[PDB]
Design a protein around this ligand. Structure first.
Ligand SMILES: O=C(O)C1=C[C@H](O)[C@@H](OS(=O)(=O)O)[C@H](O[C@H]2[C@H](O)[C@@H](NS(=O)(=O)O)[C@@H](O[C@H]3[C@H](O)[C@@H](OS(=O)(=O)O)[C@H](O[C@H]4[C@H](O)[C@@H](NS(=O)(=O)O)[C@@H](O[C@H]5[C@H](O)[C@@H](OS(=O)(=O)O)[C@H](O[C@H]6[C@H](O)[C@@H](NS(=O)(=O)O)[C@H](O[C@@H]7[C@H](O)[C@@H](OS(=O)(=O)O)[C@@H](O[C@H]8[C@H](O)[C@@H](NS(=O)(=O)O)[C@@H](O)O[C@@H]8COS(=O)(=O)O)O[C@H]7C(=O)O)O[C@@H]6COS(=O)(=O)O)O[C@H]5C(=O)O)O[C@@H]4COS(=O)(=O)O)O[C@H]3C(=O)O)O[C@@H]2COS(=O)(=O)O)O1
Ligand SMILES: O=C(O)C1=C[C@H](O)[C@@H](OS(=O)(=O)O)[C@H](O[C@H]2[C@H](O)[C@@H](NS(=O)(=O)O)[C@@H](O[C@H]3[C@H](O)[C@@H](OS(=O)(=O)O)[C@H](O[C@H]4[C@H](O)[C@@H](NS(=O)(=O)O)[C@@H](O[C@H]5[C@H](O)[C@@H](OS(=O)(=O)O)[C@H](O[C@H]6[C@H](O)[C@@H](NS(=O)(=O)O)[C@@H](O)O[C@@H]6COS(=O)(=O)O)O[C@H]5C(=O)O)O[C@@H]4COS(=O)(=O)O)O[C@H]3C(=O)O)O[C@@H]2COS(=O)(=O)O)O1
Lengths: 196, 129, 211, 129
């Protein structure tokens, strides 16, 4: 009694995108059936996959129509397609794997910024601060202290990377600091404003 | 980039946190959804507001522990963003300090009152956009 | 027809010690059977385990008599015991989990070492270098020379003299300390402790002043 | 610490690399084995000799790809120690540059001539001692 391969557990195939942090073990399954019993094969980005194609390789448990990847890494990012097929038909599902590396550290400020600037009395000057940080960082501008700018709903990160000092005076002369910190630590870069 | 929007992929079922323009909050697996682009802003070290870019609303958790997005900010739109040791993020309400933002394996949120440290619904993975 | 719980797949329980690097997903299983169907519970170091006991918690698949821990960390190091039991008996196996944190970086030298030292002519002096490195590091001691008032060679590299090199003939035991016996105005100068692994190179210098 | 001995736990079955005093090389899961304490020494950046402390011999891979431990060092006792992207280590023979030190899931080594990048046999986890 011929029957083309078919998904036996279609619901456990709903999650097409698997985003995980590195090293996490990932397993994709294609529970299917059909007589005569269908064969199961996998494809990484359309091409033919093979155990030696990744460290530790892959493990295929036909018993559960699944493929397993131990300690996944950026190199594994891609599309994986399972192909269940017998003599009377074929079916296939495709999962998307995305591996995320997290940078759990205090914010990092672009070296060199802000930059010392010497300007004419009354001029206009703008200081810059390029911040990097996985967790949402909180930037704040200081004058040596006097808080001059602080990230938040009132002052979004859009405008926090640049401090504008309009029509300066001998008073505005001094050291400014860009302080940015997240829940892991604090980082800051200073800079000197020289007014003539 | 801290300034670019992000999508919040919840470990529990792969649902992206989504903010509807009407204020409803739930999840969608579709990466192309027009309401999953969120602008996370820090209000201070370890504390963020989560703003749905398209809905132009803020994710806020009410006292009963239900989610929704306000048009204007309130003390309920602030959460402790924490990069857990497993590399997933958790958004714990700074107001109702024992509850997290979470999604059920069905694409609907989970009452903060029902959220907990050992749960998969609370884990989120920030993704560029 | 009563039957006490029993191991159905004893062979896949052979590996009692699971050593892995952090974050790796760990899964312990205790394939067993018995009628009436036995219950499955787990124990971390004898005590009762609970999902909120670890971030991300754990997941138990009775379907396969397994417990799963995603992204494991040092805090998870310990003994895990599964207890399968019904009304006519109980069985239990215990696995050992050990997590190793890896540091994939060029070696790191203790700040401050080696240390500048000013000494009397003819004295004895020893420089020190404390190195850290997950991958086996290769330490080497150098002396910077000047072939004239020139401390730099044509290729824009510094004239140096290898003084000590890690290896089978000079094991890491004695590599963290350089002994300069009975110094002379000649020995005066800058010494460098260079250590490097497959990821990068690190070095700390120091000045020897002889009077 | 890089100066203290280490045990090399092979991902393939949890066997610790062991060097017998007579030169035989294989694996043992028993962490208390008297012959699994190895002294890894660097001969230079990324290259190490692996010496069984007890056996007082060096792990060397012969041309046919079989392992054994010499009483004295030879150009065949040097391997490229590499911390792979998945956090395990691989000891590739500097001489027969395409082969690795590995153990079968049965506790015996695996001929270098049969070792390869995608294999679990080559992955090792260094552990303090
Ligand atoms: O699901 C679940 O549950 C899971 C999932 C996941 O993964 C996880 O989770 S987490 O969380 O952790 O992540 C987990 O996992 C786990 C699992 O589960 C477990 N499992 S159970 O089931 O138990 O439970 C574990 O696992 C384990 C096991 O073991 C398995 O599993 S199963 O079940 O499936 O089984 C797996 O396994 C695997 C392994 O590992 C691998 N390895 S590597 O390294 O590679 O990577 C692989 O393997 C392979 C190899 O090859 C081997 O092994 S080793 O050790 O070495 O490595 C083997 O092999 C073999 C073969 O087979 C044989 N063949 S037959 O045919 O028999 O079949 C051989 O033999 C042959 C022949 O025969 C000979 O001859 S005589 O005389 O003997 O006869 C010869 O031949 C020839 C030659 O060749 C020549 N030369 S030339 O060159 O020229 O060519 C001359 O000389 O001459 C001669 C003669 O001629 S004739 O004609 O005869 O041929 O040789 C040979 C050949 O080859 O050919 O033998 C071999 C060996 O020996 S030698 O010699 O080579 O040395 O086996 C294999 C295979 O393939 O199989 O693979 C495997 C499998 O695969 S899959 O698919 O499955 O993947 O896995 C494992 C591991 O470890 O992993 O455990 C796991 C882990 O985890 S824990 O936690 O536990 O830690 O869960
Ligand atoms: O095959 C294996 O052995 C296997 C082992 C490995 O873990 C893994 O391999 S690995 O190497 O890749 O890691 C792999 O695991 C995958 C699973 O196999 C796969 N399952 S599949 O269906 O076969 O494909 C999938 O599993 C996840 C699923 O969501 C689900 O699987 S299922 O088979 O059971 O359906 C399962 O769900 C969990 C859920 O995630 C837990 N959520 S929590 O927040 O962390 O606590 C937990 O849910 C609780 C909650 O309290 C609750 O909220 S929630 O949002 O739904 O989660 C909800 O509340 C119910 C309420 O209790 C009801 N009231 S009652 O009637 O009185 O009971 C009612 O009011 O309705 C409420 C909600 O209804 S609603 O859903 O409509 O909104 O439910 C509960 C509850 O306990 O059920 O627990 C459930 C059940 O867990 S379990 O008992 O089955 O273990 O587990 C999932 C998971 O393991 O994460 O994905 C796995 C790995 O994928 S990935 O994430 O790593 O990428 O294969």
């Amino acid at each position: 009694m011929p029957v083309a391969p078919y998904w036996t557990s279609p619901e456990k195939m709903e999650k097409k995108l698997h985003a995980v942090p590195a090293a996490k073990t990932v397993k994709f399954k294609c529970p299917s059936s059909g007589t005569p019993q269908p064969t199961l094969r996998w494809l990484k980005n359309g091409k033919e996959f093979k155990p030696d194609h990744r460290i530790g390789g892959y493990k295929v448990r036909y018993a559960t129509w699944s493929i397993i990847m131990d300690s996944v890494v950026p190199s594994d990012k891609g599309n994986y397609t399972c192909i269940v097929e017998n003599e009377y038909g074929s079916i296939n599902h495709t999962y998307q794997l995305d591996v995320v590396e997290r940078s759990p550290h205090r914010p990092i400020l672009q070296a060199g910024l802000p930059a010392n600037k010497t300007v004419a009395l009354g001029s206009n000057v703008e200081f810059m601060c390029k911040v990097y940080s996985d967790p949402q960082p909180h930037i704040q501008w200081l004058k040596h202290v006097q808080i001059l700018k602080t990230a938040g709903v009132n002052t979004t990160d859009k405008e926090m990377e640049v401090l504008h000092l309009r029509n300066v005076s001998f008073e505005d002369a001094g050291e400014y600091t860009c302080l940015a910190g997240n829940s892991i630590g604090l980082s800051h870069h200073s800079a000197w404003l020289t007014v003539l | 980039h801290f300034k670019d929007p992000k999508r919040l992929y919840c470990k529990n079922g792969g649902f992206f946190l989504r903010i509807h323009p009407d204020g409803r909050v739930d999840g969608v697996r579709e990466k192309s959804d027009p309401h999953i682009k969120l602008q996370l802003q820090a209000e201070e070290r370890g504390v963020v507001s989560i703003k749905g870019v398209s809905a132009n609303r803020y994710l806020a958790m009410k006292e009963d522990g239900r989610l929704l997005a306000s048009k204007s900010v309130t003390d309920e739109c602030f959460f402790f963003e924490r990069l857990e040791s497993n590399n997933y993020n958790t958004y714990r309400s700074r107001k109702y300090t024992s509850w997290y933002v979470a999604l059920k394996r069905t694409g609907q949120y989970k009452l903060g009152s029902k959220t907990g440290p050992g749960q998969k619904a609370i884990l989120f993975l920030p993704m560029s956009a």
